[PDB]
Design a protein around this ligand. Structure first.
Ligand code: MG
Ligand code: MG
Ligand code: MG
Ligand code: MG
Ligand code: MG
Ligand code: MG
Ligand code: MG
Ligand code: MG
Ligand code: MG
Ligand code: MG
Ligand code: MG
Ligand code: MG
Ligand code: MG
Ligand code: MG
Ligand code: MG
Ligand code: MG
Ligand code: MG
Ligand code: MG
Ligand code: MG
Ligand code: MG
Ligand code: MG
Ligand code: MG
Ligand code: MG
Ligand code: MG
Ligand code: MG
Ligand code: MG
Ligand code: MG
Ligand code: MG
Ligand code: MG
Ligand code: MG
Ligand code: MG
Ligand code: MG
Ligand code: MG
Ligand code: MG
Ligand code: MG
Ligand code: MG
Ligand code: MG
Ligand code: MG
Ligand code: NA
Ligand code: NA
Length: 152
RNA sequence: AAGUUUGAAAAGCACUUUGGAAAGAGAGUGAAAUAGAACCUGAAGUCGUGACAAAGACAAUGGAAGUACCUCCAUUUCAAC
RNA sequence: UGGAAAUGGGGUGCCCCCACCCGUCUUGAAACACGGACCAAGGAGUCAAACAGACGCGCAAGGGAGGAGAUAUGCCA
RNA sequence: UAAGCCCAAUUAGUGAUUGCCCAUUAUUCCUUUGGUAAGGGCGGAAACAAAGGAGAAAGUGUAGCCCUUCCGAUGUAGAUGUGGCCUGGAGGUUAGGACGAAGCUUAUGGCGUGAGCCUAAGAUGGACCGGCCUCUAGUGCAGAUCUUGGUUGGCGUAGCAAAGAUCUAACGGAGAUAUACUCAACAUGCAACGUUGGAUACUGGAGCGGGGAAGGAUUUCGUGCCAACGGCACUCGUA
RNA sequence: AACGUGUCGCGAUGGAUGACUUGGCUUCCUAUUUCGUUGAAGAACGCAGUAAAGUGCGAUAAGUGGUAUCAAUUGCAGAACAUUC
RNA sequence: UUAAUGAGAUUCCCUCUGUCCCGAGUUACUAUCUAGCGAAACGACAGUCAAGGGAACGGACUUGAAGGGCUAAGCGGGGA
RNA sequence: CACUGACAGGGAACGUGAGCUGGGUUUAGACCGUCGUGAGACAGGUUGGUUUUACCCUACUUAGCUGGAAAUUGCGAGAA
C-alpha cells in the first residue's frame, strides 16, 4: 500500500511523493497544507510570491510564540512566515507531478490538487555541549510528503 | 550492544519518462513487493489525512435514568400465523 | 420475504439529578504530608534439614530402612 | 395582617381518632447466595409408530438429582473454603489444521455476580495446535526517587551576541533571468557558494610570522567527490 | 470563524508478540589420557592471483610429505592423476 | 614601649564627585522581526475569587460572586 | 538637634530575599578572658568569610483577530 487515499478516476490523475526530505517537518507541514484544494497553476503562483515576500504562508498549528504580520490577514490569521527551504522543496514536487500528468496525456492547466499529507520520518542524532560537563541531544526532524491531483 | 529470520529459487526490478542527484511515475519477476535488502510476523504509545458528531465560559474523567441520531451485531416473525 | 417489521445489545451528543486524586504511614487525608509524563518487556514467601499438630494411605506389638548385592539385564539413571 | 418568638391544632363549638414531604429503617412481593438448616420423591403405575413434549443421578462441592419451607446476608488487620478463573512444561485420553495453526486488530455479539470463556469479521498472517483427568513450577503487576528500550508536552521556544569587516566585477557551477492567462520592464525563483583582478581593513616582530622538544601518528601531496561530519552554509575541507 | 475536542477508515514512526534455534546450563560414562633448556604457556611481526577483520599457517608461510577416498573448489580469475601426481 | 614597613581593623580633615536631593540625554551589543539551525529544567490531573468548615492558611468540597473563544510582548503576587 | 498644621497607633505568613542588600545571628581560619589534666566549651568580646533558575499555568499591564440571544441548534415567533 502506498497512498492513504485513492483518486476518484485513476486515468485522469497524477501522483508524486518524496521520503526523508531533510526539511523541518513543522515548517513543511504548514507549507504543503495551504495548497490542498487549489488549482495547480494557482499553487505555483503562490510559491513564487512567497519567495518574493509579497505573500506569506499561514501557520495554524505549529505557531507557538512566532511573530505577527499583516500578510496573514488573507488567511484569517495573524501569524505567518516565509520558509524558503520548504518552499523550494515543494516547488520541485509539483514539477514532478506535472511531468507525470503530461506523460499520461492530460492538461496541466485543468488539474486540481485533491490530497496532501505530511508525516514525520526517522530522526538523525547529533550532540551539544552544556555547562558543568553535560552532553545533550541535538536532533533533526525530516518528513515524508505525498500528494495527487485530478483533472476538472 | 548486536539472531544478516527476503524468498522454494536472486528469478535482487531489463526498458520508457521527469530530475544535477537522491528519487518519483510507469513497466516487469515472483503464489505473494501489503516479501524491495540488515527485507518473516509487525502490538502498544505518539503523529498525519478523509468523513462525521457536535460543542460557550461549570478542568476533564465518572454514576443513574431517558431521549435524538446511527449501527459491516444478534435473535424472532411474516397468514384462519 | 423486503434496501421489511420488531425486540435486545453496541456507539456518539444532550437534558434533570448525583459525584473532592490515586497508592501509603497515621487517632485523623481531599490536604499547603510523601511517591506519581506515556507505552512495551522484566520484577519479590523459594529450596534443604530437625520438630510438632490437623488430614489421606499401608501394616500393627510390631513398623521401616539405608548402604550393598543378585539376575531378568548384557531397552533400562 | 412574618416567612420572627412562646403556646396550641388538622380542615374546625358540625357531629368524636391518620393534613402533607423525604431513607440502603419497618411491612409485604420477586430473584440470588449460605445454613448447627426442616421436610417429601427416587421398585419407571397402565397405555401410546411416524405421515401433548421432555426429564427423573440414593446425591458435600457442577449447567447444582427434582420439588416445598424457614432464617441470615455491610466490614480494615487477619483466618479459612471453592467439580473457582488464568500461564509454561510432563503422564494419559479425545480431537483440529494449506478449503489455512499460533500470533495480532475490533461500535463482533453471546454467556458468567466475577476472575474469564466462546462465536463472527480481517479487503491480517503463513505452520502448528484445542478440550478433559492427573502430575509439576523461575505461574497472574499500576506505582518500589524500581530495571532496560522506545516515545512525548514544554517547542520551531531559550538561544547560536569576547577576539572591530567586508564591498565590487568577471569566470565556474544543476544551484537561473526557472510564470497558466494578461503583459514592457518593478509590483510572480528568493537566499547562498569557490577562484582571479581591484578596493577597504586587521595582526603590528612578547605576531592568526619562520623553525624544534613533549604529545599525536599519515593529519603531508595530487586527482576526484559532496551520503554522513565541519552546532549557519559550501561548488570548499585536517571529511 | 479559527484554534481546540471526540469516534470511525486509511497511512507513518516504533520494534513488542508468535513460530524457529549449528547457542547456553545441568547430569552421567569410556581411556596405552597430563607441557617445558630436544626451548613451553604467553606476547609480536608476516604469508592468498584478488584478502581489512577473523580462521589456518611460518620465508617450504590460507601450507610440503604419507595413507585412505574418488571428481571438484567456487564471488571472480586460473588450472584441468583420474589408471587416482 | 617602639622608628621603618602593611591588598590588615578603626575615627576625623582638605580635595573631589550622579552616593544622594531627583532624575534627564546619547552610543555598541542584546532583547524585539526575519532566513538557516535547534536544546534543557520540569511535567499525578489541572489552573477565576469571597466566606465557611476541614489535618487548625483550598484549584477541586458547601453557599454566594464572576467567567464568549484564540493570541504577541512583559512581569515577578500565588502555584505553602 | 532642627522644621512643621502634625510630626498618631497597628495588620497584611512578626506584608514584601527566583525584588535588592548581607551590617547582625550561625560552619570551616585566627586572637583574648574565664572554665577544663586534656581533646575542647562559653544565649562572653574580636577580625575574615560563594545569596543559584522563569521560556510553564494563573494574576496584573499594555497589544491584535473573531463568532454569538434556544448565548453556536428549533423552523421555539416577546420592539422603552
Ligand atoms: Mg522571545
Ligand atoms: Mg555549549
Ligand atoms: Mg510477508
Ligand atoms: Mg516486515
Ligand atoms: Mg501503533
Ligand atoms: Mg472521587
Ligand atoms: Mg501526626
Ligand atoms: Mg489518601
Ligand atoms: Mg491545608
Ligand atoms: Mg517519608
Ligand atoms: Mg525390628
Ligand atoms: Mg433467602
Ligand atoms: Mg461479607
Ligand atoms: Mg518454565
Ligand atoms: Mg475503539
Ligand atoms: Mg517470579
Ligand atoms: Mg507491564
Ligand atoms: Mg529566538
Ligand atoms: Mg544573534
Ligand atoms: Mg549569550
Ligand atoms: Mg564579534
Ligand atoms: Mg538570484
Ligand atoms: Mg574578491
Ligand atoms: Mg609568532
Ligand atoms: Mg552544518
Ligand atoms: Mg628455510
Ligand atoms: Mg479563597
Ligand atoms: Mg455570578
Ligand atoms: Mg504570556
Ligand atoms: Mg511567583
Ligand atoms: Mg501578629
Ligand atoms: Mg535570594
Ligand atoms: Mg518572595
Ligand atoms: Mg556579615
Ligand atoms: Mg589551665
Ligand atoms: Mg563578621
Ligand atoms: Mg441561534
Ligand atoms: Mg427564530
Ligand atoms: Na619591534
Ligand atoms: Na493545590
Amino acid at each position: 500500500t502506498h497512498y492513504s487515499r485513492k483518486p476518484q478516476v485513476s486515468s485522469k490523475s497524477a501522483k508524486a511523493k518524496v521520503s526523508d526530505l531533510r526539511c523541518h517537518y513543522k515548517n513543511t507541514f504548514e507549507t504543503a497544507n495551504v495548497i490542498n484544494g487549489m488549482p495547480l497553476r494557482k499553487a505555483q503562483q503562490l510559491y513564487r510570491q512567497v519567495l518574493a515576500k509579497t505573500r506569506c504562508i499561514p501557520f495554524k498549528r505549529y505557531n507557538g510564540k512566532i511573530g505577527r504580520t499583516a500578510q496573514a490577514k488573507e488567511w484569517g490569521q495573524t501569524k505567518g512566515r516565509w520558509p524558503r527551504k520548504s518552499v523550494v522543496a515543494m516547488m520541485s514536487l509539483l514539477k514532478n507531478a506535472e511531468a507525470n500528468a503530461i506523460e499520461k496525456g492530460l492538461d496541466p492547466n485543468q488539474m486540481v490538487i485533491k490530497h496532501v499529507q505530511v508525516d514525520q520520518a526517522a530522526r538523525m542524532r547529533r550532540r551539544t555541549y552544556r555547562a558543568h560537563g553535560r552532553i545533550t541531544p541535538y536532533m533533526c526532524s525530516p518528513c515524508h510528503v505525498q500528494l495527487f491531483m485530478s483533472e476538472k
